[PDB]
Amino acid sequence: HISSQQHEKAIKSYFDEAQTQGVIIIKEGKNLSTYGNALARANKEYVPASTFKMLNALIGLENHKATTNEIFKWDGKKRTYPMWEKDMTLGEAMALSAVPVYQELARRTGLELMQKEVKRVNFGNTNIGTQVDNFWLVGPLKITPVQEVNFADDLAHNRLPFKLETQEEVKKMLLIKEVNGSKIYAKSGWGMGVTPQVGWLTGWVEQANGKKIPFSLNLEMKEGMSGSIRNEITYKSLENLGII
Ligand SMILES: *[B]([O])([O])[C][N]S(=O)(=O)[C]C1=[C][C]=[C]C(C([O])=O)=[C]1
Description:
- By secondary structure, this protein is an alpha+beta fold.
- Helices cover 36% and strands 20% of the residues.
- It has a single domain, classed as DD-peptidase/beta-lactamase superfamily (Beta-lactamase), CATH 3.40.710.
- The protein has nine helices and six strands.
- Strands 2-1-6-5-4-3 form a six-stranded antiparallel β-sheet, sandwiched between helices.
- It binds 3-({[(dihydroxyboranyl)methyl]sulfamoyl}methyl)benzoic acid.
- The site of 3-({[(dihydroxyboranyl)methyl]sulfamoyl}methyl)benzoic acid has 11 residues, from β4.
- Keywords: Hydrolase, Plasmid, Signal.
């Protein structure tokens, strides 16, 4: 067995080498562990960015604003990324992190119902303000990494206050990787309309044996960083800890 000094040093080095600052929080049962090169980030608020898609989708499905097979049609207007210029389900929009689709869903839900559901879930600071289509991108909604891993822990275990079927539909949308009989469920986030920019990967490992290990990586993205650094640092960290 590797010392935890070694674990903490190895995981800190993954952040150091990506030349960023960040934290990965791992929950094992009820025990939270904080790793990385900027531990104090663990209890600081950031916009949830596209991590909010998880709750956005729970809210919309529970409230019959969409079904899992409905196709959100591209309206033909130029999008920020050409990959978004196509027709997609909530599932496909989740994988592509297609903001316009999740904005449409937010608009269907409406400000009033959205506010009620976010308070009911008590997600982050629970504050959505007045614009139903961008509160998760630029504020006022904010959340700590500890809160994000706890949200992930809830979803993984079907503990959120939504039907089981709602939760299962959403979890099916989040499978991003399989590694030696482990499945990684997670949602990326990248908040580019805040400064500094925040990057997220929040989810859980479902191990071969049934155990679900939640995690939230939170870091600072800067210009010319690749998105996949969030993934790379996560996988390296989970492997270093023998979680995958
Ligand atoms: B959300 O935070 O992922 C949306 N962020 S974005 O629209 O500013 C840029 C973007 C596009 C596609 C994928 C990502 C990502 O986070 O994986 C981000």
